Design a protein around this ligand. Structure first.
Ligand SMILES: Nc1nc2c(ncn2[C@@H]2O[C@H](COP(=O)(O)OP(=O)(O)OP(=O)(O)O)[C@@H](O)[C@H]2O)c(=O)[nH]1
Ligand SMILES: Nc1nc2c(ncn2[C@@H]2O[C@H](COP(=O)(O)OP(=O)(O)O)[C@@H](O)[C@H]2O)c(=O)[nH]1
Ligand SMILES: CNc1nc(N2CCCc3cc(OC)ccc32)c2cc(F)ccc2n1
Ligand SMILES: [Ca+2]
Ligand SMILES: [Mg+2]
Lengths: 440, 421, 67
């Protein structure tokens, strides 16, 4: 058992779900009509891929997923796209009016209108589960649905599923792709409203992903389709431990033991290698030690920060493909001597390693080279708090003149929610300082 | 579907509203009958935003034509395309407004108003998801100004949670001699500050100076001016009428452009009147603003730019990044990333690359200061108060609109002066 | 030792519950203060739009004091 339900909220969450579920299918050999020739256990099974897919009696494997958007544009594309056949209609939940980039409309006004329907659909999924593990919530910080509705849903999930695990994949806003001047406000509000209800949240900085595409794939002006296809590879590495079997395979929950030293310090930094173009990958084979080094180059992180000017409280390597531990061990020993890896004084400095032998996949006509081996590093570094400073600074510039705050108050919110959210962020930033200070 | 309900009023209202429907009908592929003879289906994707669908595959503007004199109303259907409109949606008076604002707001417009309201409701209730309304009018012509602002007030009372977007045409002594226009405009503004979400300031002084100086038209016609306005108006709706990276609608524009509910008076810009650097350069140039204001005389609170045509957007990215860099002291520093841009593939008819520029600049106080000066030249004299105080208005009703608009610029100057540190 | 073994499991339940509680209540409180707030705002907008119609009565009644 050990099933995970994925919830995709708002535009960014829904489109990243498209990327992810198309990739999963290609990894597990599922066709766009849900059929899987290799699964001989018809109508069910407890194979690893069943943690993400249920099976109908007719042989269809159906994502344990739910797409929610306050408007129908983005989810109508799913309803008619290549994988329309994968999803039962009840799984695709749209409204009529979106949140108009407003956390308040997402959380209260428009969002109170659909929450019960959503939770009812989520329940219909949980009820198919013989041993449900937790939820995977994909959403943007920036959008009004992404931020306001996500947090409403998170609050409600805590009520209906108690302490049952809620992980986040959160899109952190970047000027290069921003859609709204108000994205810092929505960002602080949802981060505050959710902090108590999330167990582990993997942040993706749109500028980090934008730069990586520009540098390593040279896409002059990458699209959401460019960005999402790279995000899905990192999402696939994190979940590979749940969907695939493996002798050398470490359950993601075992990495969470190491990644969360205190409940509020639950924001791991993801770094992925190799991201290389077909032409630059031709005749050039990247060794276990090469891709492992890449993980400690800050230009390969999902979030822009300098781990070199912060401290590690955890370091994990999730390898997939042609990798054996001897190589891994060699590579780590070299990096240890030749790189700037300072741990806080209260936690051991070892590196936690997992290996899935199934090699990464690329999507047809994608820009990513199909490589023989790949790695995602998950580290808990104080450096990530830089991303909170940047965002917290933008928030402050506008909130000191109360710019745009009337669109939030006219929807029923109070200025006190803003200062209460910001103060939580200020304490979050101080928590990140405290953990790195030495012991006495 | 996201339906805007259109509304033209008064003399200037209906005319600039007509050329609007002509231009977008042509871009969207729709002839004066209401049938679709277009190349790309991109012209229908969002066609329901401005168009009722009628069997026989006929598209009917969701428009409400209004006036207190039937002259303008007759010229409409007689005009090019007059037969694509809904005949029920004409709503004419007879008496007329006679360039009096009190006649449009309180008395003669007050009688015709409930009949217009009836037409609004019929069209509104037919909407899957009502965005709200856009009203074209002028702020000097008695019917457009007074009734327009009354019709706003009434629509807001019944749709308090829909966006009220107006195209308002500003009186310039370079285009109309009629002496009471500083009175009309100032009384309309006192209303526009309180009951609209977004107003594009269409300045006739800026349209006249454009045609005179840039276009070198010695004597320009209301048809030359209104040529500018339709290119403007086609621009600032391109993201409503066509797909895009962003799901543009009238509320998302308000959220992102209006940092304070009162400062919702936008300076529009068009270019050309070319290479991506030139559009960008011109489109930030005071000579391409459709309001008589210099951006380099205030600071931008927020800006939105629409690039129409087929251009390397990576170029547009760097070009728009260039202008803010080289012009940084002209964008408030306390609103980060306050310049957005969208790019559409379909350019208007006749230009291979246009750009349209919407700007919340504190230099708009320039426009309001002009009108506040023409106003007070009369009000200090008490001149013509009888046309209004005879229709039942107090004198304190003129003093109050005058102090309200005075404040609106104090506030524009308060945020131009504000700093981060 | 068994007494303590059941106190720990009772504490975990007690706390898992008090958490589902305070959530449930924090939401309902927020949603209620929000409905009140948003409504107070729309009522304010009308009370003042409607004072505009009472001033359209006073204005028209002054012009009937003209004949
Ligand atoms: N990586 C990635 N980011 C996206 C994508 N789509 C939107 N975003 C980001 O999401 C942020 C805005 O939130 P959205 O998800 O688009 O808005 P929403 O969730 O639909 O909520 P609404 O305001 O009601 O529309 C922007 O900063 C975008 O950068 C996507 O497809 N991929
Ligand atoms: N730009 C422009 N302005 C106009 C036009 N027609 C009228 N105006 C302006 O509007 C004012 C008169 O308003 P008017 O439309 O006559 O009011 P109405 O008679 O009730 O419809 C004058 O100051 C004109 O400058 C037009 O076609 N274009
Ligand atoms: C409906 N008209 C409209 N709206 C826009 N929006 C809505 C979408 C978020 C948004 C954010 C903004 O930050 C300053 C400004 C504007 C806007 C818009 C944006 C453009 F970049 C170009 C043209 C546009 N046209
Ligand atoms: Ca099976
Ligand atoms: Mg949306």
């Amino acid at each position: 058992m050990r099933e995970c339900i994925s919830i995709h909220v708002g535009q960014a969450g829904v489109q990243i779900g498209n990327a992810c579920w198309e990739l999963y299918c290609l990894e597990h050999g599922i066709q766009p009509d849900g059929q899987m020739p290799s699964d001989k256990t018809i109508g069910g099974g407890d194979d690893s891929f069943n943690t993400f897919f249920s099976e109908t009696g007719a042989g269809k494997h159906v994502p344990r997923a739910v797409f929610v958007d306050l408007e129908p544009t983005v989810i109508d594309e799913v309803r008619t796209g290549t994988y329309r056949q994968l999803f039962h209609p009840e799984q695709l939940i749209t409204g009529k009016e979106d949140a108009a980039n407003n956390y308040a409309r997402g959380h209260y006004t428009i969002g109170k209108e659909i929450i019960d329907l959503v939770l009812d659909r989520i329940r219909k999924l949980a009820d198919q589960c013989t041993g449900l593990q937790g939820f995977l919530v994909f959403h943007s910080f920036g959008g009004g649905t992404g931020s306001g509705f996500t947090s409403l849903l998170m609050e409600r999930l805590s009520v209906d599923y108690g302490k049952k695990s809620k992980l986040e994949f959160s899109i952190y806003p970047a000027p290069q792709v921003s859609t709204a001047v108000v994205e810092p406000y929505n960002s602080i509000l949802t981060t505050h409203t959710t902090l108590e209800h999330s167990d582990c949240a993997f942040m993706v900085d749109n500028e980090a992903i934008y730069d990586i595409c520009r540098r390593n794939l040279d896409i002059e002006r990458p699209t959401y389709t460019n960005l999402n296809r790279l995000i899905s590879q990192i999402v696939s590495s994190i979940t590979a431990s749940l969907r695939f079997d493996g002798a050398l395979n470490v359950d993601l929950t075992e990495f969470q033991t190491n990644l969360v030293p205190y409940p509020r310090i639950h924001f791991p930094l993801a770094t992925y290698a190799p991201v290389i173009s077909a032409e630059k990958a031709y005749h050039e084979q990247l060794s276990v030690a090469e891709i492992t080094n890449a993980c400690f180059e800050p230009a390969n992180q999902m979030v822009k920060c300098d781990p070199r000017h912060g401290k590690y409280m955890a370091c994990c390597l999730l390898y997939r493909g042609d990798v054996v531990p001897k190589d891994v061990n060699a590579a780590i020993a070299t990096i240890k001597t030749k790189r700037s890896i300072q741990f806080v004084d209260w936690c051991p400095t070892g590196f936690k390693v997992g290996i899935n032998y199934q090699p990464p996949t690329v999507v047809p006509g994608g820009d990513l080279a199909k490589v023989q081996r790949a790695v995602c590093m998950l580290s808990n570094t104080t450096a990530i708090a830089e991303a909170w400073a940047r965002l917290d600074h933008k928030f402050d510039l506008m909130y000191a003149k109360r710019a745009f705050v009337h669109w939030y108050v006219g929807e029923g919110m109070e200025e006190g929610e803003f200062s209460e959210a910001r103060e939580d962020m200020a304490a979050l930033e101080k928590d990140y300082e405290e953990v790195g200070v030495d012991s006495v | 579907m996201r339906e805007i309900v259109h509304i033209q009023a008064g003399q200037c209202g209906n005319q600039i509203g007509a050329k609007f429907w002509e231009v977008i009908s042509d871009e969207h592929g729709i002839d004066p009958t209401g049938s679709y003879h277009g190349d790309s289906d991109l012209q229908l994707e969002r066609i329901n935003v401005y168009y009722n669908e009628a069997t026989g595959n006929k598209y009917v503007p969701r428009a409400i034509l209004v006036d207190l004199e039937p002259g303008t109303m007759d010229s409409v259907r007689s005009g090019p395309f007059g037969q694509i409109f809904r005949p029920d949606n004409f709503v004419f008076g007879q008496s007329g407004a006679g360039n009096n604002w009190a006649k449009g707001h309180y008395t003669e417009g007050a009688e015709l108003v409930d009949s217009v309201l009836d037409v609004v409701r019929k069209e509104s209730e037919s909407c899957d998801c009502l965005q709200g309304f856009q009203l074209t009018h002028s702020l000097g012509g008695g019917t457009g100004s007074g009734m327009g602002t009354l019709l706003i007030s009434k629509i807001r009372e019944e749709y308090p949670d829909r966006i009220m977007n107006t195209f308002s045409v500003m009186p310039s002594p370079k285009v109309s001699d009629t002496v009471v226009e500083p009175y009309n405009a100032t009384l309309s503004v006192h209303q526009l500050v309180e009951n609209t979400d977004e107003t594009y300031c269409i300045d006739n002084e800026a349209l006249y100076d454009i045609c005179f100086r840039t276009l070198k038209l010695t004597t320009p016609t209301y048809g030359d001016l209104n040529h500018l306005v339709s290119a403007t108006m086609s621009g600032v709706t391109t993201c409503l009428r066509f797909p895009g990276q962003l799901n543009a609608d009238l509320r998302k524009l308000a959220v992102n452009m209006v940092p304070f509910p009162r400062l919702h008076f936008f300076m529009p810009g068009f270019a050309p009147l070319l290479t991506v650097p030139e559009l960008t350069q011109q489109m930030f140039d005071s000579k391409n603003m459709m309001a008589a204001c210099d951006p380099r005389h205030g600071r931008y609170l927020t800006v939105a730019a629409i690039f129409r045509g087929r251009m390397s957007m990576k170029e547009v990215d760097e070009q728009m990044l260039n202008v803010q860099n080289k012009n940084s002291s002209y964008f408030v520093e306390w609103i980060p990333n306050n310049v957005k841009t969208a790019v559409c593939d379909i350019p208007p008819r006749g230009l291979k690359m246009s750009a349209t520029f919407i700007g919340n600049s504190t230099a708009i106080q320039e426009l309001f200061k002009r009108i506040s000066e023409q106003f007070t030249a009369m009000f200090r004299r008490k001149a013509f108060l009888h046309w209004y105080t005879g229709e039942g208005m107090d004198e304190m009703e003129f003093t109050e609109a005058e102090s309200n608009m005075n404040d609106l610029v104090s506030e524009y100057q308060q945020y131009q002066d504000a700093t981060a540190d | 030792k068994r007494e303590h073994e059941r106190e720990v499991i009772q504490k975990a339940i007690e706390e898992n519950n008090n958490f589902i509680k305070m959530a449930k209540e924090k939401l309902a409180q927020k949603m209620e203060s929000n409905k009140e707030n948003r409504e107070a705002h729309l009522a304010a907008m009308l009370e003042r739009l409607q004072e505009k119609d009472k001033h359209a009565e006073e204005v028209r009644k002054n012009k009937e004091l003209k004949e």
